[PDB]
Amino acid sequence: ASITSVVKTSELILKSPLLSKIVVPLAKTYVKFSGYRQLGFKMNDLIIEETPNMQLALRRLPPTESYDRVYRLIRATQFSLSHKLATGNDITKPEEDDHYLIPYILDVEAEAFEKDALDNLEVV
Amino acid sequence: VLPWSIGVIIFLLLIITAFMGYVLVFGQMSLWGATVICNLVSAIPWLGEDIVHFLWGGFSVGNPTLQRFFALHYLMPFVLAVFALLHLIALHTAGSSNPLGITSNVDKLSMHPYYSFKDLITVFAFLLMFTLFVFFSPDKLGHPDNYIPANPMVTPASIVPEWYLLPFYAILRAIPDKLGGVIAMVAAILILLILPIVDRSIIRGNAFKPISKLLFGFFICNFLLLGVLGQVHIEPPFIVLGQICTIFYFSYFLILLPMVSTIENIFFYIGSL
Amino acid sequence: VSPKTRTSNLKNGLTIASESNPLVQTATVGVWIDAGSRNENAYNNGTAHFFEHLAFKGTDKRSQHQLELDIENMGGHLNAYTSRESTVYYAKSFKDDVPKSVEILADILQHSKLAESAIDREREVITRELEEVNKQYEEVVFDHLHATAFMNQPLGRTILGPRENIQTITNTELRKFITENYTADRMVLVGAGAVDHDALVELAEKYFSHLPSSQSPVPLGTPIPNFVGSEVRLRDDTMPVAHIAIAVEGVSWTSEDYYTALVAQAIIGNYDRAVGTSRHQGSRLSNIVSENNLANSFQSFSTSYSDTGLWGIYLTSENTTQIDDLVHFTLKEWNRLSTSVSNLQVERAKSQLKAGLLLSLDGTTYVAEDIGRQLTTLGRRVTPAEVEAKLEAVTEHDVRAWAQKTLYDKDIALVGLGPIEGLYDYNRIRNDMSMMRW
Amino acid sequence: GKSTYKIPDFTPYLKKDRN
Amino acid sequence: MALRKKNSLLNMANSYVLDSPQPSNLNYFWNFGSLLALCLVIQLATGITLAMHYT
Amino acid sequence: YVKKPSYKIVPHFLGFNIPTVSKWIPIFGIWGAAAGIGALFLIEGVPRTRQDILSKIPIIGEHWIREIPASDNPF
Amino acid sequence: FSTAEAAGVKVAAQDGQSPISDLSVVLRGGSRYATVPGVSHILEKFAFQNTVPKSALRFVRELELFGGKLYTHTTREHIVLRTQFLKQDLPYFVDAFANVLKETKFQQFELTERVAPVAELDLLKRESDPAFTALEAAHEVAFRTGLGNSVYAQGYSPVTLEDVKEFARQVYAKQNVAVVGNNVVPADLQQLVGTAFADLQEGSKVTQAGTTTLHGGEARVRTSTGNALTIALPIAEPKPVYHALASFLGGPASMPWSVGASPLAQATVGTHTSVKATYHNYGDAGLFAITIKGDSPAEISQVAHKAVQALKDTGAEVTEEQAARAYAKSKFAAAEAFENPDSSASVIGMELLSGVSRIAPENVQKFTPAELSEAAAQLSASAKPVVAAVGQVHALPFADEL
Ligand code: HEM
Ligand code: HEM
Ligand SMILES: CCCCCC[C@H]1C(=O)O[C@H](C)[C@H](NC(=O)c2cccc(NC=O)c2O)C(=O)O[C@@H](C)[C@@H]1OC(=O)CC(C)C
Ligand SMILES: CCCCCCCCCCCCO[C@@H]1O[C@H](CO)[C@@H](O[C@H]2O[C@H](CO)[C@@H](O)[C@H](O)[C@H]2O)[C@H](O)[C@H]1O
Ligand SMILES: O=C1C(O)=C([C@H]2CC[C@@H](c3ccc(Cl)cc3)CC2)C(=O)c2ccccc21
């Protein structure tokens, strides 16, 4: 599934008061149990990147954000192989779990989906 | 997806190899197994019955069949080793996945010495388990009936195939239609081919998906339940139970995985905002 | 709505065609001739280009130097080009300098000295032009492409002609050439910009009245070409960019399929990585090429002649290891003209052409070139309304029909110049002209 | 021998009705 | 340049069993691939041997 | 005057649209015939194929009506 | 061109009888106003990228449905964005320019992946001509900053997205924008621009950092791709007589396969070199250049001597015939400039954005031999001659040799 899909659907939920009231607490618990923060990941580090679109989004990251992503992945790989969890400052605090990549992939995909749409346009 | 899809074919070839090898003993189970597998093509309408006779080289499983199973059982493993090699070659473009499901391009290790020595641990653990079966209990995994020579006049009252075919055998028993039963049984393997489509997750694998892990746990346990139901008697209440397990097996690929993976996508995004 | 193109004839048969634009202050008058290199045989090949040099080498009245001064004093410039089928001689000037310029053009065409001394002087200049076109890779490719596509036929000859001919061209055979070919019934005096038609016709009656008429006056744009599927490879590993042209036998100016072939050409389109917008063009090939960096550029063309044409594409690429892909994808895009095109591509290309055919005409020299080209190829100026009607008549079914008879599984003329090691042999290229899946 | 625009003689092989 | 990289045949083996770059954190469930390879080798050895004795 | 270009996006899926696919419908037809002809040709030897298909074809069908005389048939 | 005003934006349009309209937004944003080197070129190439209402992709695909074309260039004085389309499609292109000036998302990826690589290809294509490089180098020597800034973005000085966004904040403002429509009904354009560019910032007139200072010197760009030599003479008081002198001195041939009867053209006899005298008015400073390209540095050196001699000889005496020839060549140059859409737009752009009334070709002053000789004398006796050599610079002339 595309990140665009996921983001638009999430926005539909956050709009509806009823929906957000029941879903936002679920999703926050889900994320706590997911436990990716315990390896010092940001949510966006876990998005599948072996795709044309994502490779392009990752090339668009500012050098700073890109270097830090590499570090978090290296560090998480090291936690994984040691079967340890992050401790202290390595644990991702909720305030640090920023969607650094979502804007870039949404732009990549916006263009890719526009391209598909316009490839199928019919002059009227 | 390519190594996965080639893998699904290796899985089918292993089933056919191991089966063709089962038949070569020509004990009671061997002959009956041959009869059933060679009659799965009778499901195919019109030409079906003639194909059956063609695969038996006779009107029944007999000498002709056994000799052609020997030929093919010898052959099939080399074909299987080709496919095993091919799925590695297909994998070599992407490299192995890893348990986090993130890229590993940031941090790679040479296959040797690290995984060579890591693979020895399991080689020796495997050989320990192998030794316990081979030397101490060589017949625990076998069916007694295969030590009776093939008698085409009786089939044993207790028909139970190899432990590994049991899940699909229970599937075949579940469906009360000839063609239905066969289709379902084959589809239980071929449906793995659609996992690339029906998993809608933006995240690779289940390490970080509590809901998917629970669904996977129930799917695995259901596949083991099918295994168990494959070896009970065809009696109440296990007839209905086997059908429910069959529906659950297919609903994992067709309903639950697509739904759960969609919902977890949304939970990751909302949950991390 | 552009002003009406007025057309008059003289007695000798000279056509005068004019399109006034009272919004501009300059004017391009010139003479379009339905004659070019094609009108030579093999012995005098290069004569037409030779003449173009000598036209400005002085007349019976004004010497070379006097000629130079007369035009400098006019203020504008004179220009000429000889192509295979058309020779043009025009003069861009100011509005009220038009009588001078028509007078100068009439002089250089009718009353050229062609003095042995000047023939001998230019014989070196033109010989040196043979080894300096060498640099203009586009032209080298297209000259080879004509040479190969129309192997040993008049269209296959170059314009400059062989070295051998340049050394042996005499004032006699130059005179004979322009007496046989530059006849009134083959010429069109064209004025665009600040010209009055009636004034231009008076200038033609004054200057071009004593032009020879041919014995057998055929209509303008009257022609037997047998295209050769063939390749030329001019592999040059030292060159950084490969230039490849591929062409099939295309359409003549007067073909019933002329607009269909232009539409088809617009579906494949042009691409140039140096233009900002090109990565976003609708063309399928453009998308493949830009995403994969397969080419620096490609340019579809449909060159037409009186009785044949070439339709094809000209590619440039620095990606020397993926030229196979570049050619592969290009020809697969042509295949889809036969197999896949629908109203989606056809209507898009028609929209882009409906504008394109009018966009081209943006200055007096372009207008004059359009009047002149149309009058010498079709015998009339086709109005924008008629052009819009002919384009509207092109349907998706027509494009598929045309592509299936002209492109699909047809022999190609292929010219490769430069580091084209990666371009496969002729069979593998020609095999891409069909789809086994169709 | 020299000019690359003079295509070598192919008349021994070329079919007249090739198109 | 190392023989294992130079020689075409060795280079293919090298690329699979020696220099092959693997993620650094594969857990024990990544070991089944090689066990299936070992099973396949055992099966070929014992199988061909039984074929020498089986009618 | 024209204020906006006048178009729609046609429905599409995996880069196929109905305009394009409709142009290939004939070709699938022919390939289906080729698969039909070819498949039937492959199994022309199968006795059921003769019995149930090929012997039923008018005029031509007598090609596949062959009886072995019972004098020459051990079975 | 009926010059008018529509919601604070200067709009010039000339209706015609053609199916083709050219609508050009001229921005007072050329290189002389450039905050950092090359930013005006980058800003030009960042036009019609992604806007908030409409993506670059969608713009280009829709433009191709109308069969419009888009052409953009940067000068030292202006950025010009020109669209060529069919008359009827005017509203679309007005609105598209409005989107570009109001709502361009200057995204860092566009600059890295799209704009900068294309700006680099643009300049490499121009530098293939050594004459271009020589005349660029000459402006750099002559003016240092302002007019001396490079027009084009180069690799050695990177423009950042902050630089381009800053510059565009200044430039994309009512005060620095002129809309010029060739073959556009003037009444219809005023109405459209008045609705579309109403919400554009007012902003401020962009100004040159520092006043224009003239300097002499030498520039020696070593290339391996052809040889050229500019001999430029900065003008502190730009006068229209330098146009006449440029056209008189000439250099290009007015006839195919000829040398020409112009003094500079007669300086190239015996050589495969070309010469071109050009004069560039920039309002407050001017540059008279004589540019010589050719493949032989020995020939260029030979011509360069003859060229400066020609200018000195002109300072002595012009004939009446020669002065008339100058008037004619100059009127013609003015006419064809006002015809070519690129130059046309910038001509009226100047008139609109600055206040310098366009000199209509029919009103070009006739210069007497006295006035022309006087003008050539001032140039031969210039205190600040610039000489820009490109190519085999060790073998080209120096300023003190000339
Ligand atoms: C003869 C049987 C098989 C052998 C010998 C074999 C061997 C291997 C090996 C050595 C690897 C790489 C190391 C590893 O990940 O364990 C691997 C990876 C893989 N195999 Fe198999 N395999 C076999 C059957 C299968 C089957 C039946 C499937 C799928 C249905 C499969 C799918 C894969 C996939 C998808 C990978 C890539 C997994 C990853 O590393 O993330 N294989 N296999
Ligand atoms: C994947 C590889 C193989 C598998 C999964 C496999 C599986 C089996 C199985 C399940 C049997 C029944 C064993 C029994 O209960 O007695 C068997 C028998 C046999 N297999 Fe294989 N086999 C494999 C490879 C081979 C190969 C390569 C040969 C080479 C000939 C071979 C030769 C035999 C023979 C001769 C028998 C019958 C004798 C017997 O039952 O032990 N097998 N095989
Ligand atoms: C001798 C060169 C010939 C190349 C093929 C031979 C085998 C080969 O490539 O071995 C490798 C050691 C491979 N393992 C891995 O990729 C591997 C990768 C990552 C992690 C681990 N372990 C984790 O802890 C691995 O174990 C393996 O076991 O795959 C066999 C199946 C291959 O056999 C064939 O395909 C041919 C035929 C015998 C099936
Ligand atoms: C019993 C069967 C006989 C053949 C089996 C032997 C192993 C299988 C090899 C077949 C696959 C070869 O396919 C190709 O080989 C080359 C040559 O090493 C390898 O190439 C790989 O390593 C080399 C250098 O080590 C790198 O330059 C390259 O980037 C990488 O892809 C890859 O593995 C694969 O791209
Ligand atoms: O009735 C059966 C039976 O149904 C299978 C079954 C189970 C697994 C089947 C199978 C599973 C998966 C695939 Cl991809 C193909 C076949 C093959 C037939 C047997 O193996 C068997 C053996 C001995 C006596 C009776 C029987």
Residue numbers in the entry:
A (entry chain R): 2 to 125
B (entry chain N): 111 to 383
C (entry chain A): 26 to 248, 260 to 474
D (entry chain E): 39 to 57
E (entry chain N): 1 to 55
F (entry chain J): 8 to 82
G (entry chain B): 15 to 416
The authors write:
The cytochrome bc 1 complex, also known as respiratory complex III (CIII), in the electron-transfer chain of the inner mitochondrial membrane is a homodimer (CIII2) of two biochemically identical protomers. CIII2 catalyses the transfer of electrons from the lipophilic two-electron donor ubiquinol (QH2) to the water-soluble, one-electron acceptor protein cytochrome c, contributing to an electrochemical proton gradient across the membrane. Electron transfer within the complex occurs through the prosthetic groups of the three catalytic core subunits: heme b L and heme b H of cytochrome b (cyt b), heme c 1 of cytochrome c 1 (cyt c 1) and the [2Fe–2S] cluster of the iron–sulfur protein (ISP), often called the Rieske protein after its discoverer. The Rieske domain is tethered to the complex by one transmembrane helix and a connecting flexible linker that acts as a hinge.
(v) +Atovaquone+antimycin A: with the Pf-type inhibitor atovaquone and the Qi-site inhibitor antimycin A. In crystallographic studies, problems of domain mobility can be overcome by Pf-type inhibitors, which fix the Rieske domain in the b position where its cluster-bearing tip is tightly docked to the surface of cyt b. The poor solubility of DQ limited the accessible concentration range, which may explain why we did not observe density in the Qi site in the consensus refinements. Atovaquone was resolved in the Qo site in the +atovaquone+antimycin A sample, with the Rieske domain fixed in the b position [Fig. 1(d)]. Atovaquone induced very tight binding of the tip of the Rieske domain to cyt b. As expected for a Pf-type inhibitor, the hinge region that tethers the mobile Rieske domain to the transmembrane domain was in an extended conformation. Together with the widening of the docking crater, this allowed close association of the Rieske domain with cyt b. Atovaquone formed a hydrogen bond to the cluster-ligating His190 (2.8 Å). In addition, Cys189, His170 and Leu171 of the Rieske domain formed hydrogen bonds to Tyr279, Lys288 and Asn149 of cyt b, as previously observed. These inter­actions stabilized the whole Rieske domain, improving the local resolution. As expected, the Rieske domain was mobile and thus poorly resolved, except when the Pf-type inhibitor atovaquone was added to arrest the domain at the surface of cyt b.
